[PDB]
Design a protein around this motif. Structure first.
Motif, short mmCIF file in Angstrom:
data_model
loop_
_atom_site.label_atom_id
_atom_site.label_comp_id
_atom_site.label_asym_id
_atom_site.label_seq_id
_atom_site.Cartn_x
_atom_site.Cartn_y
_atom_site.Cartn_z
N UNK B 13 0.79 -1.19 0.00
CA UNK B 13 0.00 0.00 0.00
C UNK B 13 0.82 1.24 0.00
N UNK B 14 0.40 2.22 -0.84
CA UNK B 14 0.99 3.52 -0.99
C UNK B 14 1.28 4.19 0.28
N UNK B 15 0.26 4.11 1.13
CA UNK B 15 0.32 4.58 2.53
C UNK B 15 1.60 4.09 3.26
N UNK B 16 1.99 2.82 3.12
CA UNK B 16 3.09 2.30 3.85
C UNK B 16 4.48 2.85 3.27
N UNK B 17 4.42 3.01 1.98
CA UNK B 17 5.39 3.74 1.17
C UNK B 17 5.57 5.25 1.39
N UNK B 54 -3.27 6.10 -11.18
CA UNK B 54 -4.24 6.81 -10.36
C UNK B 54 -3.81 8.30 -10.10
N UNK B 55 -2.53 8.47 -9.74
CA UNK B 55 -1.94 9.70 -9.38
C UNK B 55 -1.80 10.58 -10.58
N UNK B 67 -4.12 12.44 -2.19
CA UNK B 67 -3.34 11.34 -2.78
C UNK B 67 -3.56 10.10 -1.98
N UNK B 68 -3.56 10.20 -0.69
CA UNK B 68 -3.64 9.06 0.20
C UNK B 68 -4.98 8.41 0.11
N UNK B 69 -6.06 9.16 0.13
CA UNK B 69 -7.42 8.59 -0.24
C UNK B 69 -7.56 8.16 -1.70
N UNK B 72 -6.04 4.36 -2.15
CA UNK B 72 -6.50 3.39 -1.12
C UNK B 72 -6.96 2.03 -1.56
N UNK B 73 -7.64 1.84 -2.67
CA UNK B 73 -8.07 0.51 -3.09
C UNK B 73 -7.04 -0.32 -3.79
N UNK B 74 -5.96 0.33 -4.28
CA UNK B 74 -4.89 -0.25 -4.99
C UNK B 74 -3.93 -1.17 -4.21
#
Lengths: 147, 74, 147, 74, 147, 74
Positions: B13-17, B54-55, B67-69, B72-74
């Motif tokens: 997840x992007x978030x963790x990145x 997406x971005x 960006x963070x929302x 999210x599904x990715x």
């Protein structure tokens, strides 16, 4: 923080290590949970901007959130500067200067300056202005970090 | 580890990145302007194809909550 | 450290064991992590050079880093001596001597001397000069110890 | 254990060895000048051939961050 | 220890249990490691001989070392007596007696006597003399207990 | 998680569900009037058929202790 001494004046005293550690431990345990905001509010009683950057800078982890907050603090600060323009002409010898967003964020001001503003008569609540920005930015985080 | 070596996994997840990015960015000491350049540039560039796609649709001017929302599904 | 007493003067008081142990524990747990620097900064509030050598000397482990720091402290000290030459002629009876890099590092000065410089009017911030060297040397370490 | 008995393994990272060195150096009580002599001398001498080779290429005047980053892949 | 009171005089106050326990815990955890010596030094700030025997007597374990230290303390004490001979004729009514090695070791002196010497003008630093013997004997131990 | 996504299981006690509701309601920041509207509306609507049936029999005007004791055997 700036606290009242026995003599009956407002003087600065340092914040305590088990207060510091209690701030750390809250963040460790309850991360983004809402109870963090009243908790913060209690532990920020009588606190300076300088002490508030200390608390934010001493975080470990949750760096995406810490960056989102920073950027909220600067936005709210940019907004302070916008809404309150600088005042007319040169600064008086008899007076002390009005704060900017960055003085509220603690960045451009010194401690003695932060004590001047708060202890002086009328006093200006630069803690409470930063506090709302922190709480506002805390809402942003809480709302995002809801799953 | 260098900031150029920070990249998003194919299942990560992007978030963790993004957390990894501002931690490593936290150990970079460069001028703010350079660090702004790194933010808009390197983050998206080492992001995975699915989120990268997406971005690209968010366009420029985008902020971190969006960006963070967005990814999210990715 | 040198703290303000109730009477309204600056006097030396010793640092506390659970402060000492909190310094130890930080180093144990977070090693070279950046949070160590604000943490250090808070726990070094009002601290002497003498107390700062105490904190550095009481480290166990990470001896490569401890040596790199030492060598940074001496380089920064060598640089203090370079930039600030000794002053003209003999020292006045009415005055106290200017510090060198080694007085800032605490090495050539005594405690009462460290209290003279800081408490006297104007005061000289020999803590804050060593503090930057420590923080600078902390950046060196952090940057190296990044993997 | 004596300071002369401190040596780098054939698979041991230099880093782990340098830590051992300033720990044992930490239990030596000799004049600073002698301890400087020990630093430039004994450290390299008991370093392993692969890193030893590396350190010879740094030349003299070298400092610990540069030695420590120099023998990292070894 | 002998500490300064609020009134501005030097008075004796007892050492704290979590100070005592911190001394115990250091010894438990780091045994003969060098960090023990700065640690000791901080926790011995303003301490009496009497408090220093208390700290040594309250050790458990490492009895070979504890005996080596004792024997170093007596050697260093024997050396104090050698180097400083007793003084000429009877002791003055107006004055208090010079210490011996055993008064420095706390053995032949009483607390009030230990407070007389330290609080009086000039003061004599019988703590710091025992402290060097302890640190010297700590070097002996550290050097031996290196493997 | 969104407030609309809060629903009662087929075997889940209402009680455990009501706790979840005012926790999520605790993360909603809306006007009190809207939050009153959410209370009387969404809570019952996402309640399970067996309790839902029960709650319909309490009629309107009902308070939380009476709802909470009403759906206890369910």
């Amino acid at each position: 923080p700036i606290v009242q001494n026995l003599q009956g004046q407002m003087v600065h005293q340092a914040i305590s290590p088990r207060t510091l550690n209690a701030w750390v431990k809250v963040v460790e345990e309850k991360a983004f949970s809402p109870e963090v905001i009243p908790m913060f509010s209690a532990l920020s009683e009588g606190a300076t901007p300088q002490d508030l950057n200390t608390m934010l800078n001493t975080v470990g982890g949750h760096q995406a959130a810490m960056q989102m907050l920073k950027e909220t603090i600067n936005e709210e600060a940019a907004e302070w500067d916008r809404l309150h323009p600088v005042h007319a002409g040169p600064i008086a010898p008899g007076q002390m200067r009005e704060p900017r967003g960055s003085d509220i964020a603690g960045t451009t001001s010194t401690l003695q300056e932060q004590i001047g503003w708060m202890t002086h008569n009328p006093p200006i609540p630069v803690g409470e202005i930063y506090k709302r920005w922190i709480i506002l930015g805390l809402n942003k985080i809480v709302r995002m970090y809801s799953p | 580890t260098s900031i150029l070596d920070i990249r998003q996994g194919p299942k990560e997840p992007f978030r963790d990145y993004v957390d990894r990015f501002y931690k490593t960015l936290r150990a970079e000491q460069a001028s703010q302007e350079v660090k702004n350049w790194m933010t808009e540039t390197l983050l998206v560039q080492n992001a995975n194809p699915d989120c990268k796609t997406i971005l690209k649709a968010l366009g420029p001017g985008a902020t971190l909550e969006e960006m963070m929302t967005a990814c999210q599904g990715v």
